[PDB]
């Protein structure tokens, strides 16, 4: 089974991520992200925005079962982290998720 704390840091250490809502919507708009994660308590506009764009593309969306705040952590930063866009797993098995 898909280890999400462990994985999505394989995602950042050996590919590539987007962090926060403006990115990810931009890269979910331009079909540049593999993945789109989105924290439980974003807001609600933002939630739909993601949803729309990546759906016009085929990006899977996930929901992160925790706050921003957790998801913040989890990335290492000290502040809050609403959604993230994976745009290369590198050798991270998030994409399983999807």
Sequence with gaps: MVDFAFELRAAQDTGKIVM???KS???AKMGGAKLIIVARNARPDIKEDIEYYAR???I???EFEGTSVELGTLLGRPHTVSALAVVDPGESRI???G
Aim: aromatic content about 14%; glycine content about 14%; proline content about 7%.
């Design 25 to 27: 919507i931009q890269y």
């Design 56 to 58: 016009l593309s085929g």
């Design 20 to 22: 926060g809502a403006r």
């Design 95 to 97: 994409l399983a998720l």
């Design 60 to 62: 899977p969306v996930y």
